[PDB]
Amino acid sequence: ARSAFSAKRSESRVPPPSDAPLPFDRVLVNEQGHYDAVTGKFTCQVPGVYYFAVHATVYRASLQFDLVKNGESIASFFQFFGGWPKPASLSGGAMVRLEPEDQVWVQVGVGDYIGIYASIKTDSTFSGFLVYSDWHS
Amino acid sequence: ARSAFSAKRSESRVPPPSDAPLPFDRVLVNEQGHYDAVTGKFTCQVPGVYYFAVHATVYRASLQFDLVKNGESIASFFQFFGGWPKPASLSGGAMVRLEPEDQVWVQVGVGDYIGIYASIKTDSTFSGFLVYSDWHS
Amino acid sequence: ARSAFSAKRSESRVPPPSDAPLPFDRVLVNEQGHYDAVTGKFTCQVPGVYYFAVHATVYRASLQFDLVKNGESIASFFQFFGGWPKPASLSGGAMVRLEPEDQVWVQVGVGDYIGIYASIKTDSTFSGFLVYSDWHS
């Protein structure tokens, strides 16, 4: 079985909202269409164990994000932004078992820690892939 | 073949010891039981090449950790903690060939750089998985 | 199919050049020889989708790097180095589809942000692996 995606954040002057999934609308690879660039969500179609990774640029505010499965935090990450003139960075990752229709996305969990960023020479990426399948009848 | 795990650090007021593996006792996924949440060690049962990743929160002290194979550093990582009021972050990762009974874990390598952290909205994760097997007779 | 590698940066007093790939000449694993420790480049021999990750130590200058495919930026990353006495850190990663003869490497994209580092207890690693193949006739 196969399932993989990777996408990047678009540049924006709008402070990132913290009441919806973080958007990663510039798709690098999504051959199964399991990631939805409009909603920011990965939707599982193959039961199995997956790795997810976020590699974010942090600027103008601290960044707190949760990797979530159906709304539940799998793992939470944070980077302090101490009033610096240029960006910092924050990565997070974890593995999880998924079943078909389960969804995974990234979301700010503490609503003012919204400092995810992209610019001409900086990106924030969200990637995930099936490591092994585990189908059952 | 299949082998994968991911686990997170528990919250604790105890400064992390630097004379034993770092603990990640909150298991996200460990379907083969190849990771041991009591010892903090992954023990290989399938020869092959693996990826390991640590995504850590850093607070109250700088953090230095080694990804180790049987006690030997595969790769070492560090993040300065400059007297900030909230956490920083540190990720590390590498690939390695393992044979059955080989063990991989995370450990502080410089014994005062013990700033690995977890809290209600921050985590430190340790994950690893088989990318391909290479059995021989 | 199989393809994987991981390598680390050597210690050096020379400020890193920004007109060539960043070198990672200490090989951890490269069983197919798809990575070239002399050039710093991975060259694809199996069509498919790959994950790449860089886990860098940052010291003496800020670090900006691009993960590149044939010279084109897949994704760009940055970490501010604010005049601190010890290193910071920066990770980046993404997935990409490759075909045979495509090359992937890491390079400084803004030519003074050259702060990638290694020392006795710090490393910078570059890793990548095939997640699934997609051969065609």
From Swiss-Prot, chains A, B, C:
GO molecular function list: identical protein binding
Keywords: Collagen, Disease variant, Secreted, Signal
A GO BP annotation: protein secretion
UniProt main location, coarse: secreted
Domain named C1q: residues: 2-137
GO cellular component: apical plasma membrane; bicellular tight junction; cell projection; collagen trimer; extracellular space; lateral plasma membrane; plasma membrane; transport vesicle
Locations listed in the record: Secreted
Coiled coil start-end: none
Disease linkage: Late-onset retinal degeneration: Autosomal dominant disorder characterized by onset in the fifth to sixth decade with night blindness and punctate yellow-white deposits in the retinal fundus, progressing to severe central and peripheral degeneration, with choroidal neovascularization and chorioretinal atrophy.
Miscellaneous: This protein is produced by a bicistronic gene which also produces the MFRP protein from a non-overlapping reading frame.
Complexes and interactors: May interact with ERFE. Homotrimer (via collagen-like domain). May form higher order oligomers by supercoiling of the trimers.
Protein name: Complement C1q tumor necrosis factor-related protein 5
Organism (species): Homo sapiens (Human)
Organism taxonomic ancestry: Eukaryota, Metazoa, Chordata, Craniata, Vertebrata
Gene name linked to the record: C1QTNF5
Residues of the full protein shown: 103 to 238 of 243
